[PDB]
Design a protein around this ligand. Structure first.
Ligand code: MN
Ligand code: MN
Ligand code: NA
Ligand code: NA
Length: 327
DNA sequence: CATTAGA
DNA sequence: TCTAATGA
């Protein structure tokens, strides 16, 4: 956690670099187990060898260790960090929509900068177009103060269209979070569950409405169950306009809301931990349901859930408010 | 790990 | 169809 810090650190630096600049999934994949392990190791690793003893730690990595323990540096790391080429790849990458593959490609073509990114807006797909567009506003945090406004709104329309829709703004915001990266609305409806062959319009109506009133200003990807866009709160009585925000809304078969909600609510560890728990308690929990476990090793049969509670009850736990789902 | 764009 | 990118 701190004792093995630098090690795993350059380690992740290293892996992340393969997979991005290089198409070296393996080596990249290497660096990670190693980093994974040394990370777990209970003692200050003092030299290649020591480390070396570990599963996943080869002569290659071990080699880097020493260099690193001897000199609090690494050439490859010093050389990469410099590399204008791989710098570019790391950078272009931030663009919402740009990934390594494309990061490379642009680079090759010679699109290194954001300005390059502009002059060549043609070479970019819509995703990335918007991605380039709201580049600033994308990178910014979302004041809870604003979250409340946004949430306030979504809620309204959702209801306006059909009183029957149920909505939940999940993620950190739900968990208290003084800020947030983007809003996650989870949605469901009674008419929609496990069997009943969809009703695509379900998602649809909603989006249409959101845009209807001008909340959603763009579409990143509307699909039959996952919309993915951009929103913005009405810029009041001018002088101060609102930053474009990522928004995601997903339709859910009513008979799986809570688990999903539970899930998306996090935190990542509370989740795990909870998950890890359901298990001893003789169960299974995942993004959509919760199943009683059986001795033969495994089992099925999706237990009924009416609220975050039910889930808790099941594994017989203490109801924990979103606020304290921190871990 | 699954859902959407795109080509 | 596959192959990218998001997310989480
Ligand atoms: Mn999100
Ligand atoms: Mn989020
Ligand atoms: Na070893
Ligand atoms: Na990106």
């Amino acid at each position: 956690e701190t004792l093995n810090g630098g090690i795993t650190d350059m380690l992740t630096e290293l892996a992340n670099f393969e997979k991005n600049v290089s198409q070296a999934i393996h080596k990249y994949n290497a660096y990670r187990k190693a980093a994974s392990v040394i990370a777990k190791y209970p003692h200050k690793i003092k030299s290649g060898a020591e480390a070396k003893k570990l599963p996943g730690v080869g002569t290659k990595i071990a080699e880097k260790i020493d260099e690193f323990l001897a000199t609090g540096k690494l050439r490859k790391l010093e050389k990469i960090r410099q590399d204008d080429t791989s710098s570019s790849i790391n950078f272009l990458t931030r663009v919402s929509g740009i990934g390594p593959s494309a990061a490379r490609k642009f680079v090759d073509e010679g699109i290194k900068t954001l300005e390059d990114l502009r002059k060549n807006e043609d070479k970019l797909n819509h995703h990335q177009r918007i991605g380039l567009k709201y580049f600033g506003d994308f990178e910014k945090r979302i004041p809870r103060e604003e979250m409340l406004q946004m949430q306030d709104i979504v809620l309204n329309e959702v209801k306006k269209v059909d009183s029957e829709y149920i909505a939940t703004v999940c993620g950190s915001f739900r968990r208290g979070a003084e800020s947030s990266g983007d809003m996650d609305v989870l949605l469901t409806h009674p008419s929609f569950t496990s069997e009943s062959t969809k009703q695509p319009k379900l998602l649809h109506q909603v989006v249409e409405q959101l845009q209807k009133v001008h909340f959603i200003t763009d579409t990143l990807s509307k699909g039959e169950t996952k919309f993915m866009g951009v929103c913005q709160l009405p810029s009041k009585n001018d002088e101060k306009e609102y930053p474009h925000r990522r928004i995601d809304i997903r339709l859910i078969p009513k008979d799986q809301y809570y688990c999903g909600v539970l899930y998306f609510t996090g935190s990542d560890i509370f989740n795990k931990n909870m998950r890890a728990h359901a298990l001893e308690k003789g169960f299974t929990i995942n993004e959509y349901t919760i199943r009683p476990l059986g001795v033969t090793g495994v089992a099925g049969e999706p237990l009924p859930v009416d609220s975050e509670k039910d889930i808790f009850d099941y594994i017989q736990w203490k109801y924990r408010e979103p606020k304290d789902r921190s871990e």
